[PDB]
Amino acid sequence: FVNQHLCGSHLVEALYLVCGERGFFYTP
Amino acid sequence: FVNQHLCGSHLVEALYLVCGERGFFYTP
Amino acid sequence: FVNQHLCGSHLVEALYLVCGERGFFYTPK
Amino acid sequence: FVNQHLCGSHLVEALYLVCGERGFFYTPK
Amino acid sequence: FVNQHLCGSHLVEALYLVCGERGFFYTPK
Amino acid sequence: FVNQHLCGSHLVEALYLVCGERGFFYTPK
Amino acid sequence: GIVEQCCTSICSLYQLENYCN
Amino acid sequence: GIVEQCCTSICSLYQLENYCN
Amino acid sequence: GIVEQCCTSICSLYQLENYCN
Amino acid sequence: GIVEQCCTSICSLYQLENYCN
Amino acid sequence: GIVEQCCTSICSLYQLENYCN
Amino acid sequence: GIVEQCCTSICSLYQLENYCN
Numbered sequence: 629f630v631n632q633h634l635c636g637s638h639l640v641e642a643l644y645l646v647c648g649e650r651g652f653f654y655t656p
Numbered sequence: 657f658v659n660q661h662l663c664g665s666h667l668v669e670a671l672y673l674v675c676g677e678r679g680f681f682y683t684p
Numbered sequence: 685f686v687n688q689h690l691c692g693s694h695l696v697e698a699l700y701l702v703c704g705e706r707g708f709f710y711t712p713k
Numbered sequence: 714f715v716n717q718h719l720c721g722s723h724l725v726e727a728l729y730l731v732c733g734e735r736g737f738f739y740t741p742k
Numbered sequence: 743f744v745n746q747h748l749c750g751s752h753l754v755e756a757l758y759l760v761c762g763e764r765g766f767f768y769t770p771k
Numbered sequence: 772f773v774n775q776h777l778c779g780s781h782l783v784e785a786l787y788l789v790c791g792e793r794g795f796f797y798t799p800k
Numbered sequence: 801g802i803v804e805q806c807c808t809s810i811c812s813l814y815q816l817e818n819y820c821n
Numbered sequence: 822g823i824v825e826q827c828c829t830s831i832c833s834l835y836q837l838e839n840y841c842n
Numbered sequence: 843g844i845v846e847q848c849c850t851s852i853c854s855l856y857q858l859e860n861y862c863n
Numbered sequence: 864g865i866v867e868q869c870c871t872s873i874c875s876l877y878q879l880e881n882y883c884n
Numbered sequence: 885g886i887v888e889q890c891c892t893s894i895c896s897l898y899q900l901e902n903y904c905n
Numbered sequence: 906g907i908v909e910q911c912c913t914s915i916c917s918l919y920q921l922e923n924y925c926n
């Protein structure tokens with residue numbers, strides 16, 4: 629639902645921060 | 657550089673929204 | 685809880701991205 | 714210009730905050 | 743759902759904008 | 772320019788995620 | 801309105817486009 | 822604290838200012 | 843407009859309120 | 864997946880490291 | 885890459901769509 | 906302080922953590 633959509637936005641932000649130069653793949 | 661770092665934050669958020677269920681890779 | 689309020693925050697960011705220089709009004713009520 | 718693009722994203726967030734139930738008009742021209 | 747975790751993320755952004763030059767303290771616990 | 776202002780918004784969101792339940796003090800100057 | 805439509809169900813970017821100027 | 826006050830209901834800007842330095 | 847007023851120097855929330863409905 | 868793992872309870876940044884390339 | 889392409893001139897949603905899986 | 910350290914150059918996670926309580 630909307631909660632999970634909003635959560636995913638925050639996940640990608642966190643992954644961006646933690647992964648640094650490694651980068652990341654995201655999939656719901 | 658800080659420029660690019662802050663740009664990337666916004667890029668990943670945009671990719672999150674554009675790619676939806678498909679997901680995405682970030683490299684930078 | 686404040687999920688609807690926080691949904692709004694995300695909604696306007698998405699509107700910003702989609703509308704581009706079209707701009708938009710946001711009228712939550 | 715990317716700097717202006719990123720500025721607008723932050724403007725919309727601040728408008729959402731300060732405007733509350735009124736909402737806002739984002740009209741970048 | 744991670745209600746409070748996502749709430750906090752928004753709270754710090756709001757505090758950032760409201761507080762300005764004062765800065766703020768975020769003490770959730 | 773507003774660069775530092777925009778940077779600060781990202782800084783606090785990063786501090787939020789890094790610090791977790793510990794929280795943090797943001798004192799920009 | 802938009803909150804009723806898009807905070808209850810996820811609106812795609814295309815659907816959100818429907819609310820632009 | 823701020824989480825109890827402002828994650829339960831929406832805090833006004835004046836309420837949030839209690840947490841400024 | 844907002845971009846001219848507020849992307850070149852920092853606008854306060856009170857200044858930004860001029861763009862509320 | 865990540866949504867089931869990390870939207871149902873909080874994932875630490877260390878846990879999130881698992882999703883990096 | 886995306887930073888190179890996307891980070892001085894604005895990339896459209898269409899252009900960004902190229903970076904999706 | 907933090908603005909000078911972390912907005913002049915990108916701070917690592919470690920450098921950020923220094924600022925936590």
Ligand SMILES: Oc1cccc(O)c1
Nearest residue numbers: 694695698806810811
């Ligand atoms: O339906 C929604 C609500 C919030 C953000 C978004 O991209 C879509």
Ligand SMILES: Oc1cccc(O)c1
Nearest residue numbers: 752753756827831832
């Ligand atoms: O009560 C709240 C929670 C999050 C953001 C905000 O502006 C107010």
Ligand SMILES: Oc1cccc(O)c1
Nearest residue numbers: 723724727848852853
């Ligand atoms: O002048 C500005 C520009 C962007 C966000 C903000 O809160 C103020």
Ligand SMILES: Oc1cccc(O)c1
Nearest residue numbers: 638639642869873874
């Ligand atoms: O469990 C989560 C969910 C979203 C962002 C985050 O940093 C952690």
Ligand SMILES: Oc1cccc(O)c1
Nearest residue numbers: 666667670890894895
């Ligand atoms: O070119 C860009 C840079 C950042 C976000 C975006 O939507 C486009």
Ligand SMILES: Oc1cccc(O)c1
Nearest residue numbers: 781782785911915916
């Ligand atoms: O130095 C910084 C500034 C902003 C966000 C971040 O993760 C690091």
Ligand SMILES: [Zn+2]
Nearest residue numbers: 634690694748
């Ligand atoms: Zn959110």
Ligand SMILES: [Zn+2]
Nearest residue numbers: 662719777781
């Ligand atoms: Zn930004």
